């Protein structure tokens, strides 16, 4: 009837407003489409990446314009230490005049935000250092995204089109990904490191009116040439350096000292730059590994068919699994999620403890907010990837394509995985809150002595090989005389040593019982999640329950209340039940992250060790101590700059508390209510001249679990982020 | 700030004048048949 | 089959409904959009007028409460300008007449504005 | 050092210059 | 045998009305009328709500699904052990006849009904639908 | 419904009823901040629930620990 | 419309036909089992989904097997 | 780990003292050989007694002047903390494992009755007592029917979804 939906004609032709709903929400399942073809799909993929592309450029655009327009930023310069970062100003007619006094804050600029990004530290280190270097950044962004935009248009013409065997080329695009994309890209940020960044931390000033005839080494590029390459590590900075001046800097450009600049606490320039350099040698080596159409090279094809233990161990092998990965979209989704999830977990945990900006270790609000921010989105990105490992079993698996080789084996012992899955996470489960239980009890009780406070021995004894001397094991980069010691003593463990000794950093801070009981806490997460989203995609395509779930596909309701009840049975229901058990598990890890580090930054330490091994201690000493400013951001004796964060939290209160009501609540409740509803607006006067056009109805079953979660999963991110940045900002 | 009137007619066209054209005419679209 | 009710089946009920312009016998839709328009648009004005975030300044207080009602009459006439192009694909229940009707919604509803501020100014 | 109006002026209209493309590639992928 | 029609002068069983009858997809979209003929007055429940009296001799009501007259044919046919014919009328007059479809009730086996719907398979030997991509097919069972 | 109507039972006799009657006058125990700030949701979650679960939260050690022990595992 | 297909595992008990609400399904002649009949669903437009036909089928696996589509005015079971 | 011995720690002997004078601060508002000072002073030996405990078992005192526990099995016999985790561990296993061979022995004797559902939820307490007292040999048997291939069933007789 209608043609909203213009991708499905089923979709089209419901007559209510589930057809509204549904077309928005299937809009970007390009293969369930009306009549799409594959060489259609990708190419519809690639334009939809170029626009994505676009679109994160012009984000960067506007974060260089508005920092450069309503910012702050060369008096943050001059003052990082003692200046807050605004992000952009505020205009809002709503607001009372004390609102815009609190939120100027003794400032010229009028009501403003203070940036909790980490934007300045980062801009700063690179090597900017005007509004008009942040401008003409911003218009370049905004200059390469229209151009991006006019590439994914240019190659949706029929001339430019490209055909199905491009976008199937995986030899010649690995080459050039990682020869190019990283390695040659590595290149030229060692180039910007090098030319730009270095000389601006000692106080150069080097633009491109200049950068031709500035010097990056005195001594030229002749040592490079010559191959006496140690010229550029000589003359490093100094301990008495300061960091954009000319004072106490030495000359050096690629070096491997290790450890933090004093100043800054961060990680040295000249350092960064020859990790860049080493990083783009190597992925322009392997870059150089597959065949592509010069006859030498690696055939990922054959690769895969060689690699099968000749004892049988592993059946077939990885035979036939490049035509799985190559035809199945969902297959590299799933991959590139995993891996690109837990990439951003290790960037959340190398830039709290190896900060790589200039006074971003000092900026706790941002450090807190860069953690909290890297770890959620690795978990939804985590939760995204097994989605689509349980979309390709679905849709793409070819059981007889992949006979006999490592995927139908992992599905073939699927109990066995789902239920040692379930052990350890009933382990874990039992035993973590069985401790913790047993440690409030005897806080309780008045005899704390009683606690089980388990020593993590394990991870002490780690800590002592990389050279923490606090615990007293005396083995490896702890030991004077061992060989590992000496290896790099000349080079990097000076710095290292100096770093991972000193309890004024992030760097492999002191633990105890109580990081012992939260990493149990954390391994229980990971492990149930990880249960769950493991269950949902190996009984994707079958269970004793429904034999034949692979002929409803990835998403849908139910199947009845028949066979003893089929609520929540497809993979998509696991993927939903898995996103409550990440959120809770990122809540854990950022809790810790969190509090361990307030008390390190109040310089009381002995609160998280004496209060963290048990849940009382918890609530009251983190939650409950740490949100007495941000609920008091207004109140009836007056508000102040906090009182956004007030009203934030509870808004995420409110936002969180309505996805219950879809979550709990169920449809036909809501249906028959809606049938009263439509009856009444008939049988009322001068309400019954206007009608709808779709038919009221309730929400769907699966709709109504995914806008709950959605509900859900806004409310508890904006909760923490309005406690977190308010209690890190009110202290600090 | 340069150019300060910019805020006070930007913030009312993009939070007033632009969503209101934007959900008149995708109410227009989702309703053609 | 339908329940009839002395709400809903009185004489004087369906006496007192007739006379109102949705369901006057013969007047144009405009002319019944001018009626709605001019009653509705002359009673917004009165919460926006004593209840407005400028309703303790005198003076400013009925300006800025009737430019609100006159917003809320032109957001309104928008609102009734998409109903009909979506609903039309009883001259009333028609694409043209729900037009007509829509521009004499906008005419009354300014009207009634206009009559609310200079009663308020006199 | 402040920027000056002209150069806010110069990136609302390369910003859009950039609107109109993006808006040329929405209607090429929807038809 | 013949489809029966509908008369549309049979009465209506003695009912005081209530909230739960037709809409204005009654008049619009299409409505249906299930008939039947009472040995006796009695009361029986109504579908939509309430309690109605059902007259001697035949009988005829008009209801807003298909569902509902069914629920009622149903109530009939095993409380007052009542055969009954059920319609569906469309707002240009047209009225088509739905059930019992061939005079016989769907239970019983009858001859002359053709099987639609039916594979010639068990159901686990549906193939994946990986084989029924780009094809245009609902999904596996379809084909 | 009843824990918004017990919630509001606690915070008005705590602060308009219940207290010690002084010399001077009486001061109540919350001290009349019901009337000051129960017209808002941040009122609420401050001044009743974040002020009063106080007793609660430092009861280890006591003989009201029970109730944060309770208290903990009914959360 | 959803989608109802009869698998050839049916043992012609009729209690399909009897569970269901709406009249899609009936049982035709069939020499395929002992009770010389299988069940038909001619009438899937009329069909809710509701699955009370799967609920009533004694085979395992089922023979009567629903599969929801497309959702119009009689399938999403509206009387307005 | 770093730690101190218990015995020498200064936070250990601080909450000692921090607890028997809070128990003693209670205790002065009491009558002499009345039930609430015999209850406090109960308490008090009791405190006492179990500090002195903690402190001769050759626990290691934090800090915080709490003990920790050392359950790599490595230090715990080579510096005398065996008793803390390794020796609780092999006592649960044991206990453990005869709690799940009198269970399975349980269901494999009523596996074959002829209701075999009847013994589950009415126990046959004899036939349970006495396979209850045989589980303290469970090691044993569990090693020999691992051995002989008797403990699994096999993977052919077990039911699986469809792949
Ligand atoms: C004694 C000599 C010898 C040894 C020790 C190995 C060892 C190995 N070879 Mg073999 N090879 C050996 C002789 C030779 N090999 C080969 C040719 C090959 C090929 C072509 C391949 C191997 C591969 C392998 C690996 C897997 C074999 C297997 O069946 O896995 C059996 C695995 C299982 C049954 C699954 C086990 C899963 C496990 C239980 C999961 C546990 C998960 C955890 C619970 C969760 C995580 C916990 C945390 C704490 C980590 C293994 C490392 C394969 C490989 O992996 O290459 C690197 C392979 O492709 N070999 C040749 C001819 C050149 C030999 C002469
Ligand atoms: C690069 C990453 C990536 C790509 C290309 C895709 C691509 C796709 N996904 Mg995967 N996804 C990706 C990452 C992730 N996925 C998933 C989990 C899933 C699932 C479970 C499913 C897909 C599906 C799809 C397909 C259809 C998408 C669609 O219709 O959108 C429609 C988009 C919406 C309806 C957006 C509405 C939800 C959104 C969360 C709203 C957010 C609003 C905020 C709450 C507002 C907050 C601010 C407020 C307070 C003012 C398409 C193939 C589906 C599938 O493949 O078909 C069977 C499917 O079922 N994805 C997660 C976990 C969150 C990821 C991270
Ligand atoms: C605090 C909230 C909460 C708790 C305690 C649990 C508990 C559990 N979840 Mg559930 N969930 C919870 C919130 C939510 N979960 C889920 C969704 C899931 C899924 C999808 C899954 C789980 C699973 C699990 C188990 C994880 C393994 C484990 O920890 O074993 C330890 C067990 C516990 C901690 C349970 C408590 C034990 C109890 C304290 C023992 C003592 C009992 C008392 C003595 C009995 C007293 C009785 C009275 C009457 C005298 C465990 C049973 C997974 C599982 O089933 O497989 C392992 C699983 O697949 N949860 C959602 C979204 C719907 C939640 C919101
Ligand atoms: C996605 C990037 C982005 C975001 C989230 C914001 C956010 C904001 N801008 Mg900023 N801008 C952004 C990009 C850019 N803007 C500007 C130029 C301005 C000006 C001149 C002003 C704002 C203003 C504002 C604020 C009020 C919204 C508004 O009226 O915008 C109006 C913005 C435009 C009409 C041009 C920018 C459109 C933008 C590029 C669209 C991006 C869409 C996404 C790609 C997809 C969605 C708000 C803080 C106001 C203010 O600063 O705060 C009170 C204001 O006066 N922006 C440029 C240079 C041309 C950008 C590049
Ligand atoms: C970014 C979006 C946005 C902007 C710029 C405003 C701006 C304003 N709001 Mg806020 N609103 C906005 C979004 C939202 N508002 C609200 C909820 C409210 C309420 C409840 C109220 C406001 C009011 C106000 C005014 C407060 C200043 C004043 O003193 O008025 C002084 C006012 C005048 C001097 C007269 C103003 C007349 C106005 C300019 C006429 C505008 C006509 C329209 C543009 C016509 C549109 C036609 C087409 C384009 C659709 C101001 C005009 C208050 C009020 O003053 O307005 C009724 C008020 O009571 N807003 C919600 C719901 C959550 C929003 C979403
Ligand atoms: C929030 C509700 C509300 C408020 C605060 C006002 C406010 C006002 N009204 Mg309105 N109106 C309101 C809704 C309604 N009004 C009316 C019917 C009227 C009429 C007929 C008149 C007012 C008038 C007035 C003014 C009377 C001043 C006074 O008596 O001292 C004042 C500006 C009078 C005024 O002088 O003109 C605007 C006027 O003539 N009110 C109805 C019945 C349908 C409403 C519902
Ligand atoms: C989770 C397994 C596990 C881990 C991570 C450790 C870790 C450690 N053990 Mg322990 N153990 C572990 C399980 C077991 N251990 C032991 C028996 C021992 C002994 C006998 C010793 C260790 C020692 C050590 C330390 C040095 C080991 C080494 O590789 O030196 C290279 C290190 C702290 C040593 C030590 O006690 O500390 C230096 C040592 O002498 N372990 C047994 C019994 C078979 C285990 C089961
Ligand atoms: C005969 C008793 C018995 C035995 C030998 C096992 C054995 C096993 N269980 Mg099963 N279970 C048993 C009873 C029960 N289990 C379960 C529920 C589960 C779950 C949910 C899981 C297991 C798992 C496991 C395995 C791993 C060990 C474990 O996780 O323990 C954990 C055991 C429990 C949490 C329940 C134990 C309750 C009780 C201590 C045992 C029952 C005692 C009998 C009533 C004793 C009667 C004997 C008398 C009459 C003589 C292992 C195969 C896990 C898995 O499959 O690993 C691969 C797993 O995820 N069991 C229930 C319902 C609560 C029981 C009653
Ligand atoms: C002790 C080494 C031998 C263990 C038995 C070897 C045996 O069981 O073969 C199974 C498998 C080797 O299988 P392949 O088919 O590669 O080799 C057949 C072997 O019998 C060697 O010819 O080894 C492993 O999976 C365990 C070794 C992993 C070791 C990881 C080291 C890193
Ligand atoms: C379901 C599915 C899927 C999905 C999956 C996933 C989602 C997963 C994930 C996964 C993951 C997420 C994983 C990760 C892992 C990791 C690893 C495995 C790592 C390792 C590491 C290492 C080996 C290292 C070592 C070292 C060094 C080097 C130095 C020193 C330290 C250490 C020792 C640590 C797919 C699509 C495929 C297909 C279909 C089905
Ligand atoms: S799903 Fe319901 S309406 Fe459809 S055939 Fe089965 S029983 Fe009949
Ligand atoms: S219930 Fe199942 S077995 Fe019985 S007739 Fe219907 S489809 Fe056949």
């Known amino acids: ?185 590595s290149l030229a940020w060692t180039g910007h490191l090098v030319h730009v960044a270095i000389p601006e931390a000692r106080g150069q000033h080097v633009r491109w009116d200049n950068f031709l005839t500035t010097l990056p080494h005195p001594q030229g590029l002749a040592p490079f040439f010559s191959g006496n390459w140690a010229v550029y590590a000589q003359n490093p900075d100094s301990s008495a350096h300061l960091f954009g001046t000319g004072e106490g800097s030495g000359t050096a450009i690629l070096t491997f000292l290790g450890g933090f600049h004093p100043q800054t606490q961060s990680l040295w320039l000249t350092d ?50 490049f035509d799985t990965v190559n035809n199945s979209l969902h297959f590299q989704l799933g991959l590139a999620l995993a891996s690109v999830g837990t990439i951003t977990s290790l960037v959340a945990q190398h830039m709290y403890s190896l900060p790589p900006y200039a006074f971003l270790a000092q900026d706790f609000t941002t450090q807190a907010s860069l953690y909290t921010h890297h770890q959620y989105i690795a978990g939804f990105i985590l939760c995204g990837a097994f989605a689509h490992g349980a979309i390709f079993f679905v849709r793409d698996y070819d059981p007889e394509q992949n006979k006999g080789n490592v995927l139908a084996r992992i599905l073939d012992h699927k109990e066995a995985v789902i239920s040692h899955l379930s052990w350890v996470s ?153 996103v409550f058990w990440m959120l809770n598990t990122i809540g854990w890890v950022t809790f810790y992250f969190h509090w361990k580090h307030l008390g390190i930054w109040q310089g009381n330490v002995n609160q998280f060790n004496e209060s963290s091994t048990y849940l009382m201690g918890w609530l009251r000493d983190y939650l409950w101590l740490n949100s007495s400013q941000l609920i008091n951001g207004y109140n009836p004796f007056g508000m102040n700059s906090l009182s956004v964060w007030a009203w934030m939290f509870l808004f995420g209160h409110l936002i969180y508390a309505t996805g219950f009501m879809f979550l709990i609540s169920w449809r036909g409740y809501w249906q028959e209510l809606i049938e009263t509803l439509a009856w009444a607006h008939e049988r009322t006067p001068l309400a019954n001249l206007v009608r709808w056009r779709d038919k009221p109805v309730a929400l769907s079953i699966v709709q109504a679990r995914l806008v709950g979660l959605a509900h859900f999963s806004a409310g508890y991110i904006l909760t923490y982020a309005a406690f977190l940045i308010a209690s890190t900002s009110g202290k600090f | 700030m340069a150019a300060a009137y910019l805020p006070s007619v930007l913030v009312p066209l993009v939070g007033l004048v632009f969503p209101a054209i934007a959900m008149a005419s995708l109410f227009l679209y989702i309703e053609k048949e | ?99 007509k009707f829509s521009a004499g919604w906008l005419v009354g509803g300014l009207s009634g504005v206009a009559w609310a501020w200079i009663l308020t100014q006199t | 050092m402040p920027l000056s109006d002209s150069q806010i002026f110069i990136a609302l209209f390369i910003a859009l210059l950039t609107g109109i493309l993006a808006v040329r590639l929405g209607l090429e992928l929807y038809s | 045998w013949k489809p029966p029609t509908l008369d549309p002068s049979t009465p209506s069983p003695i009912f005081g009305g209530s909230t739960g009858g037709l809409l204005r997809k009654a008049q619009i979209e299409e409505f249906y009328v299930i008939t039947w003929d009472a040995k006796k007055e009695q009361v029986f429940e109504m579908p939509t709500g309430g309690a109605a009296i059902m007259r001697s001799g035949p009988n005829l009501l008009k209801l807003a699904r298909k569902e509902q007259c069914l629920a009622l044919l149903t109530q009939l046919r095993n409380k007052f052990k009542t055969d009954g014919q059920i319609y569906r009328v469309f707002p240009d007059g047209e009225v088509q006849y739905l059930h019992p479809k061939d005079g016989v009730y769907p239970e019983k086996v009858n001859a002359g009904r053709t099987a639609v719907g039916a594979k010639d398979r068990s159901i686990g030997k549906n193939t994946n639908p990986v084989a029924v991509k780009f094809t245009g097919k609902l999904g596996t069972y379809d084909v | 419904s009843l824990s918004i109507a017990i919630f509001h039972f606690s915070w008005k006799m705590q602060s308009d009823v219940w207290g010690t009657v002084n010399s001077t006058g009486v001061s109540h125990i919350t001290g009349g901040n019901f009337s000051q700030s129960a017209n808002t949701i941040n009122g609420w979650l401050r001044d009743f629930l974040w002020a009063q679960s106080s007793q609660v939260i430092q009861s280890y050690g006591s003989a009201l620990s029970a109730y944060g022990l309770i208290f903990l595992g009914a959360h | 419309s959803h989608a109802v297909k009869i698998y050839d595992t049916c043992i012609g008990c009729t209690q399909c036909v009897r569970a269901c609400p709406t009249d899609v399904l009936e049982m035709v002649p069939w020499d395929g089992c002992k009770a010389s009949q299988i069940a038909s669903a001619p009438r899937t437009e009329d069909c809710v989904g509701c699955k009370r036909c799967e609920s009533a089928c004694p085979t395992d696996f089922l023979s009567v097997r629903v599969y929801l589509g497309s959702e119009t005015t009689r399938s999403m079971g509206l009387a307005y | 780990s770093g730690l101190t011995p218990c ?59 709490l003990p920790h526990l050392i359950s790599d099995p490595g230090l715990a016999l080579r510096f005398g903390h065996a008793g803390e985790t390794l020796i609780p561990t092999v006592g649960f296993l044991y206990i453990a494992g005869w709690i799940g061979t009198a269970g399975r022995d349980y269901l494999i004797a009523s596996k074959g009755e002829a209701k075999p559902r009847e013994k589950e939820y009415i126990i046959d307490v004899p036939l349970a007592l006495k396979i209850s007292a045989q589980g303290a040999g469970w090691p044993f048997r569990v090693i020999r029917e691992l051995q002989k291939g008797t403990l699994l069933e096999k993977d052919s007789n077990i039911t699986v979804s469809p792949r």
Request: proline share 5%.
């Open chain 1, 1 to 185: 009837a209608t043609k909203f939906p213009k991708f499905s004609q089923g979709l089209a032709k419901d007559p209510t407003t589930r057809r509204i709903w549904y077309g928005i929400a299937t809009a970007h399942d390009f293969e369930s489409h009306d009549n799409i073809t594959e060489e259609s799909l990708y190419q519809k993929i690639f334009a939809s990446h170029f626009g994505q592309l676009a679109i994160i450029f012009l984000w960067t655009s506007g974060n260089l314009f508005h920092v450069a327009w309503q910012g702050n930023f060369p008096q943050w310069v001059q003052d990082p230490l003692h200046v807050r970062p605004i992000a952009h100003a505020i205009w809002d007619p709503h607001f009372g005049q004390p609102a815009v006094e609190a939120f100027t804050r003794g400032g010229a600029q009028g009501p403003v935000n203070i940036a909790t990004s980490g934007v300045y530290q980062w801009w700063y280190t690179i090597g900017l250092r005007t509004n008009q270097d942040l401008f003409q950044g911003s218009v370049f962004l905004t200059i390469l995204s229209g151009l991006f935009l006019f590439a994914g248009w240019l190659h949706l013409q029929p001339r430019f089109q490209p055909a199905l065997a491009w976008f199937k080329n995986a030899e010649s695009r690995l080459n050039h990904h990682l020869s190019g994309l990283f390695g040659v890209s």
């Open chain 1, 426 to 578: 009933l382990f874990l489960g039992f035993h973590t809150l069985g401790l913790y239980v047993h440690n409030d009890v005897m806080q309780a009780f008045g005899t704390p002595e009683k606690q089980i406070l388990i020593e993590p021995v394990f991870a002490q004894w780690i800590q002592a090989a990389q050279g923490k001397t606090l615990y007293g094991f005396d083995l490896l980069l702890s030991q004077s005389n061992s060989a590992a010691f000496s290896a790099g003593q000349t080079l990097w463990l000076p710095g290292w040593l100096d770093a991972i000794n000193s309890n004024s950093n992030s760097l492999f801070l002191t633990i105890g019982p109580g990081d012992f009981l939260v990493h149990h806490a954390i391994a229980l997460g990971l492990h149930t999640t990880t249960l769950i989203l493991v269950k949902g995609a190996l009984d994707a395509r079958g269970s004793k329950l429904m034999p034949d779930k692979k002929d409803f596909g990835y998403s849908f309701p139910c199947d009845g209340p028949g066979r003893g009840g089929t609520c929540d049975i497809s993979a998509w229901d696991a993927f939903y039940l898995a």
């Open chain 1, 272 to 321: 960064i730059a020859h990790h860049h350099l080493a990083i783009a040698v190597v992925f322009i080596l392997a870059g150089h590994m597959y065949r592509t159409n010069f006859g030498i090279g690696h055939t990922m094809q054959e690769i895969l068919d060689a690699h099968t233990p000749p004892g049988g161990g592993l059946g077939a092998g990885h035979k036939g699994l």
């Open chain 8, 7 to 65: 015995s020498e720690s200064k936070g250990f002997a601080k909450r000692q003292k921090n607890e028997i004078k809070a128990l003693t601060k209670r205790l002065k508002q009491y009558e002499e050989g009345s039930a609430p000072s015999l209850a406090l002073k109960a308490t008090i030996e009791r405190t006492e007694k179990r500090f002195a405990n903690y402190g001769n078992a050759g626990l290691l005192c934090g800090t915080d002047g």
């Open chain 3, 1 to 99: 089959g339908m329940l009839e009710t002395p709400v809903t089946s009185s004489p004087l009920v369906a006496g007192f409904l007739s006379n109102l312009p949705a369901y006057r016998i013969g007047v144009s839709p405009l002319l019944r959009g001018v009626e709605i328009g001019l009653v509705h648009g002359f009673l917004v004005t009165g919460p926006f007028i004593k209840l407005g975030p400028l309703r303790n300044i005198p003076g400013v207080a009925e300006r800025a409460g009737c430019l609100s009602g006159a917003g809320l009459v032109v957001i309104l006439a928008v609102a009734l300008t998409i109903y009909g192009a979506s609903a039309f694909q009883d001259p009333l229940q028609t694409a043209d007449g729900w037009q």
